[PDB]
Design a protein around this motif. Structure first.
Motif, PDB file in Angstrom:
ATOM      1  N   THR B  24       0.603  -1.180  -0.014  1.00  8.72           N
ATOM      2  CA  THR B  24       0.036   0.118   0.022  1.00  8.72           C
ATOM      3  C   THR B  24       0.772   1.383   0.107  1.00  8.72           C
ATOM      4  O   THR B  24       1.857   1.479   1.023  1.00  8.72           O
ATOM      5  N   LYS B  25       0.561   2.051  -0.970  1.00  2.00           N
ATOM      6  CA  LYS B  25       1.285   3.362  -1.082  1.00  2.00           C
ATOM      7  C   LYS B  25       0.878   4.607  -0.278  1.00  2.00           C
ATOM      8  O   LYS B  25      -0.383   4.898  -0.572  1.00  2.00           O
ATOM      9  N   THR B  26       1.395   4.811   0.742  1.00  3.80           N
ATOM     10  CA  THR B  26       0.696   5.666   1.685  1.00  3.80           C
ATOM     11  C   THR B  26       1.708   7.191   1.280  1.00  3.80           C
ATOM     12  O   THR B  26       2.451   7.123   0.631  1.00  3.80           O
ATOM     13  N   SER B  27       0.865   8.087   2.065  1.00 10.36           N
ATOM     14  CA  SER B  27       1.689   9.305   2.001  1.00 10.36           C
ATOM     15  C   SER B  27       1.419  10.109   3.406  1.00 10.36           C
ATOM     16  O   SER B  27       0.177   9.560   4.121  1.00 10.36           O
TER      17      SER B  27
END
Lengths: 48, 49
Positions: B24-27
């Motif tokens: 999962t690509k979080t920011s």
């Protein structure tokens, strides 16, 4: 019971004091403005 | 010294292999996390480089 936490200690619900009013709260908004550009060599217009 | 074993039938077998490909690509909103959305605290935070 008056206010309500979520699984991690952030109150996402509250009851109106003067009335009953179970108000659930939600945070304002936010994100990351990212700017899409063709490159200042081509042009100077950006999409956001 | 002189004996060999040779198959006489066979078997087609399908096995599976699960592999992770991506996560999962979080920011993160560095300020809004650290300093809380709305605080002169943030004005202190920029001190930290």
């Amino acid at each position: 019971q008056q206010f309500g936490r979520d699984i991690v200690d952030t109150t996402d619900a509250v009851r109106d004091p003067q009335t009953l009013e179970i108000l659930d709260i939600t945070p304002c908004s936010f994100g990351g403005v990212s700017v899409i550009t063709p490159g200042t060599n081509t042009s100077n217009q950006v999409a956001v | 010294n002189n004996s060999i074993a040779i198959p006489t039938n066979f078997t087609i077998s399908v096995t599976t292999e699960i592999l992770p490909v991506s996560m999962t690509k979080t920011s993160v909103d560095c300020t809004m996390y650290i300093c809380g959305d709305s605080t002169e605290c943030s004005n202190l935070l920029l001190q930290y480089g």
